[PDB]
Design a protein around this ligand. Structure first.
Ligand code: DY1
Ligand code: MG
Ligand code: ZN
Length: 348
């Protein structure tokens, strides 16, 4: 079935990073630190090297005295910790991480948050969807999975699992990048990573929205600890939906990947004798309308809030609005429900 997604495992890629894993960012691409860069254009084999390059460029390898081969092992473990569903794979975590690096390079993050908080945001970006199965939180509960048994009573099933997988990698032999960290700082990292990963659940975003709005309405406070907590949540959700800030071709390809993933879950729910949500039912979903709704209600407010706090982020919101206008303009060519027989949106 289209719902079966494999895990890589349980030396040549490590030695390659040990050879020339730290390359100056400009050698990767002259456009690498721009909001016009598309990290999905980077070959998958060069992504682990780009992670190190961004960490070095932000100076986190020297500021935190991170042992380079420990970081090389950790990155490869994070990469290996992703399965291969159409959307929630390593290439998604890599692109989300790159956008966190873009926010640091283009917005003045050091003038809003502590070095430790931005470093936590980046690491959380790499880990935020670890071991994702191509299915959502409702599916875990309905399929009565081990993950639902462990976490449903606490809420955010997948997000708690993703954080647990990040902790397991850290507690693996030679992957603890924070090994030399002090007891209070090591725990600070674990606590930041937990809140940041939990902020990737839509349910959470929907609950903190009024508070995000009020923070932007009043104005950011560099001395207010709660303001640092709320900013990190908005920044995490902006990294997670960052493919919408790119060109039309990226939003069109990401729609193709997410609906292939959503539709496979729906087919699995139908085989289980359950009725899927409309967006997960290939016989009911009309992708342009679903995209417009997702962009109006979820993506556009997140970037509108980011524009209110960071003036330099205005271009991001306008690209998201433009992509939304593009889906309305294209809806006349897309006259069918679901995806075409070949799973491609290239015809648009
Ligand atoms: C997983 C993703 C998402 C959305 C918001 C947040 C955030 F930032 F708000 F926190 C995180 C993650 N997602 C979801 C939808 C959705 C629609 C789309 F058209 C595109 C995406 S995409 C391309 O970004 O995968 C969608 C609808 C229901 C919620 C969610 C799926 C689910 O988890 O049940
Ligand atoms: Mg997620
Ligand atoms: Zn994600």
């Amino acid at each position: 079935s289209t719902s079966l997604y494999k895990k890589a495992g349980f030396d040549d890629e490590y030695t390659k990073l040990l050879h020339d894993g730290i390359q100056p960012v400009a050698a990767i691409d002259s456009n690498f630190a721009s909001f016009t860069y598309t990290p999905r254009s980077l070959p998958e084999d060069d992504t682990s090297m780009a992670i190190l390059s961004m960490l070095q460029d932000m100076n986190f390898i020297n500021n935190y005295k991170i042992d380079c081969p420990t970081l090389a092992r950790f990155c490869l473990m994070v990469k290996k910790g992703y399965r291969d569903p159409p959307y929630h794979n390593w290439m998604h975590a890599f692109s989300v991480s790159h956008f966190c690096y873009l926010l640091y390079k283009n917005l003045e993050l050091t003038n809003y948050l502590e070095d430790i908080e931005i470093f936590a945001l980046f690491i959380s970006c790499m880990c935020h969807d670890l071991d994702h199965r191509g299915t959502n939180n409702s599916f875990q509960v309905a399929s009565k999975s081990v993950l639902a048994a462990l976490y449903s009573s606490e809420g955010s099933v997948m997000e708690r699992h993703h954080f647990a997988q990040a902790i397991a990698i850290l507690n693996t032999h030679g992957c603890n990048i924070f090994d030399h960290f002090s007891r209070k700082d090591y725990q600070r990292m674990l606590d930041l990573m937990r809140d940041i990963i939990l902020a990737t659940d839509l349910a959470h975003h929907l609950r903190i929205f009024k508070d995000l709005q009020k923070m932007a309405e009043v104005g950011y406070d560099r001395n207010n600890k709660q303001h640092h907590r709320l900013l990190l949540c908005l920044l995490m959700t902006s990294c997670d939906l960052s493919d919408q800030t790119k060109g039309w071709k990226t939003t069109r390809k990401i729609a193709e990947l997410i609906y292939k993933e959503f539709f496979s879950q729906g087919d699995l729910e139908k085989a289980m004798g359950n009725r899927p949500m409309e967006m997960m039912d290939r016989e009911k979903a009309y992708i342009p309308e679903l995209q417009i709704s997702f962009m109006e209600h979820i993506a556009m407010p997140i970037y509108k809030l980011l524009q209110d706090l960071f003036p330099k982020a205005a271009e991001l919101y306008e690209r998201v609005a433009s992509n939304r206008e593009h889906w309305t303009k294209v809806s006349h060519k897309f006259t069918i429900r679901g995806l075409p027989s070949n799973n491609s949106l290239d015809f648009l």
